[PDB]
Amino acid sequence: DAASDLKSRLDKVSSFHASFTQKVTDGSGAAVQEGQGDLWVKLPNLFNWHMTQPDESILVSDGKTLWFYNPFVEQATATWLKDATGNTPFMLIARNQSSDWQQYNIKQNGDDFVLTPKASNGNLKQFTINVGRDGTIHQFSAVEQDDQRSSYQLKSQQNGAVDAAKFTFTPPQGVTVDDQRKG
Ligand SMILES: CCCCCCCCCCCCCCCC(=O)N[C@H](CSC[C@H](COC(=O)CCCCCCCCCCCCCCC)OC(=O)CCCCCCCCCCCCCCC)C(N)=O
């Protein structure tokens, strides 16, 4: 079915670097903001997301901690990855339990998938992904409770090995770190 097809496309992703553009649109479909940058990914749970435009910001998952670094205000926040990802389909990738997939209704037309949480919890109503049978991810989006859509268009997906140094984060010199990890 759509779920087993999606997982079989996601099984074919190992690690990549991609460039992304970002289009945020309100419920009425008007433009809220535009942005671009780089994404490094390595299954099951590692990523480095670098917005350059319009405002620079870095998200690094080392697989346990999610680091948010905003170099403009020279601040970095550390959170548990499981806390930070809990209102997303993260776990559909980060492990492969039947449990996780049963929390979503999935509709498919070719490379286009829509995932709707059964019980919607958090500000996130809906997710879309466009991913080929080869495992190239062309697009994903998240719809917030107020119908604001964040759309990511990916390109230049290079499926080489990516250095594991991409998924370490050391706060730079004179960056104040707000460590929100309760031990
Ligand atoms: C295999 C390795 C692991 C998976 C790879 C991950 C790929 C990139 C991960 C991070 C990219 C998104 C970061 C943008 C959000 C942002 O800049 N928020 C900034 C500041 S932070 C505030 C923000 C509040 O939340 C928001 O409003 C934004 C929406 C949250 C992002 C959802 C988009 C992804 C869902 C689409 C795909 C669904 C289908 C998957 C099929 C299984 O909350 C957070 O703190 C960020 C937490 C999100 C980080 C994890 C993303 C979960 C992705 C789930 C898997 C998607 C698969 C894509 C590639 C395989 C802001 N201004 O709001």
Numbering used by the authors: 1 to 183
What text does the study give?
Their transport is directed by the Lol system that comprises the inner membrane transporter LolCDE, the periplasmic chaperone LolA, and the outer membrane receptor LolB, itself a lipoprotein. Following maturation on the inner membrane and extraction by the LolCDE transporter, lipoproteins are passed to the chaperone LolA that carries them across the periplasm prior to insertion into the outer membrane by the LolB receptor. LolA and LolB share structural homology, both being incomplete β-barrels with a central hydrophobic cavity closed by an alpha helical lid, but perform distinct functions.
The importance of R43 in the lipoprotein transfer process was underlined by the identification of a mutant at this position, R43L, that though competent to accept lipoproteins from LolCDE was unable to transfer them to LolB. Here, the R1 and R3 chains run almost parallel with R2 inserting in the middle at the cavity base. The cysteine carbonyl is rotated by about 180°, pointing toward the β-barrel curve in the R43L complex while facing the helical lid in the wild-type LolA structure. We found that the Pal +1 cysteine observed in the LolA R43L structure sterically clashes with LolB, while in the LolA wild-type structure, it is accommodated in a LolA surface groove allowing the linker joining the triacyl group to the lipoprotein mature domain to exit the complex.
